[PDB]
């Protein structure tokens, strides 16, 4: 029930479908996000029709990043720098040798580094060429920033049957209120982290300078938003409330609007579009912002 500024977001699509038999069709309906559909001249279509094929992710497997130790075969070794201030290039004083690295979880995310390794003492700033503004600047945190993301749309999985054998998992009706996914960042923690980072930024761009934070300038959704995975769903959160500041030389939570996309093409891959199956129940996840 209204208003006109809610811009739908969720679309209730009705369409034909092939059943198990190769004769009679199937008039079934699903619920897709606006980022997944696109109108054509109300009749819509999947946004990936004239891009590549599409395969539905199996509900058996999971996209949960689990620690993976990389090891070297016989005759090789992995050197590890064990200094507390290794800003990551050049000679290392205290070097140790190992066969297998520590548990590195492959968390695929943008803008905000999630579930990473905390830095030692002061937060670390790493760049291949600081004077070069085209090279990214990897920031590593010392104290993790508590972030909470939720999907207040506990959903239904309709198991429509595109036989013989195959079965598509559409999104049924929503039980409860029509709410949008969002992410909380503790205001105090974000203030102390930003104030600790700007003090390290002044060590490379002059002592008495002004450091201003602005969000992304534009482009695709995967770069302008905090793209990540949680519970199987792919969130794209608005990071305009975190990078909106201006630091001179000298109690609640910041909520961020998060969108959800099911048809993704990560790693800038063309040819393979994956349909994320809907996930039943309210999805809640608490993560660590450990770097930028």
């Amino acid at each position: 029930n209204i208003t006109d500024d809610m811009r739908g977001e969720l679309k209730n699509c009705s369409f034909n479908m092939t059943t198990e038999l190769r004769d009679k069709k199937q008039k079934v309906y699903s619920l897709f996000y606006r980022l997944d559909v696109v109108q054509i001249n109300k009749e819509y279509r999947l946004i990936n029709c004239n891009t590549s094929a599409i395969t539905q992710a199996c509900p058996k497997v999971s996209f949960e990043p689990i620690p993976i130790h990389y090891c070297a075969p016989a005759g090789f070794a992995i050197l590890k720098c064990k200094d507390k201030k290794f800003n990551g290039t050049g000679p290392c004083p205290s070097v140790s040798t190992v066969q297998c690295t520590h548990g590195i979880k492959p968390v695929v995310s943008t803008q905000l580094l999630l579930n990473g390794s905390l830095a030692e003492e002061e937060v670390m700033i790493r760049s291949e060429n600081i004077t070069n503004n085209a090279k990214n600047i990897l920031v590593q945190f010392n104290t993790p920033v508590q972030i909470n993301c939720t999907r207040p749309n506990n959903n239904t999985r309709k198991s429509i049957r595109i036989g013989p054998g195959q079965a598509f998992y559409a999104t049924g009706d929503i039980i409860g209120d029509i709410r949008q996914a969002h992410c909380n960042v503790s205001k105090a923690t974000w203030n102390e982290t930003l104030g600790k980072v700007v003090k390290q930024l002044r060590k490379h761009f002059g002592n008495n300078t002004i450091i201003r934070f602005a969000n992304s300038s534009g482009g695709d959704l995967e770069v302008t938003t905090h793209s990540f995975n949680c519970g199987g769903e792919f969130f794209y959160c608005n990071t305009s409330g975190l990078f909106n500041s201006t630091w001179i030389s000298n109690n609640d939570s910041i909520t961020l609007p998060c969108r959800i996309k099911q048809i993704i093409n990560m790693w800038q891959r063309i040819g393979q579009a994956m349909y994320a199956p809907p996930i039943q129940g309210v999805i809640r996840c608490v993560s660590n912002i450990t770097g930028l």
Partner: antibody
Amino acid sequence: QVHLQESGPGLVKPSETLSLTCNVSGTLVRDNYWSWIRQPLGKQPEWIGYVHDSGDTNYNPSLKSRVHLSLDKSKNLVSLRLTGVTAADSAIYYCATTKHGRRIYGVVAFKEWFTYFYMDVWGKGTSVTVSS
Amino acid sequence: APTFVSVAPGQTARITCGEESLGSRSVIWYQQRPGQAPSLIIYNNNDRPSGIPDRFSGSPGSTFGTTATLTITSVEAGDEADYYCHIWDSRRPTNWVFGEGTTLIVLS
């Protein structure tokens, strides 16, 4: 004390304009919401619409293009106009104050809430019969 | 269309009005004495204004899939009147017509 008195013609010819007046005593008409509720003989009350200052005034979608409400702040009263009356409008029209409330279920910031209205102090009511 | 609920004096009366709940509701109840004007009894599911005894209670507007229920403890002869409800659902448009009333009758 809050006293409300409704008053109208009582008899209105078909295809005419019904005009009613709700004389308010005990409070000002600018600091409150005002709603009109009509009720045919043996039927459930039908909400006509609410009127408030600063242009906040809504009507019943079923009678949207026929009803008109107004507030006389100089005479401290509530007015009502119903154009194109028929035999279905013959009912007992009540004038009642309206207090607003906000039912919050979501996160507030994302407009995940809704405002509900409720009348607490009603009036005696007026009888309107449409006949020619 | 009309419904009746007969309860012995001193017992407990229960009144059902409106369709089944689809989302978080804010049911407003009203009482209409025969020959008088409808009066406010319980607003915001179970919040009673000044002047209404605590014998009148309403079902919480947080249960999804149940109908609005008005419980009247210690039923007396004075409670014999009509009771209407104004359903305020977050999934349904604004109801400009009160639900079908239920007549509370003295026992026997």
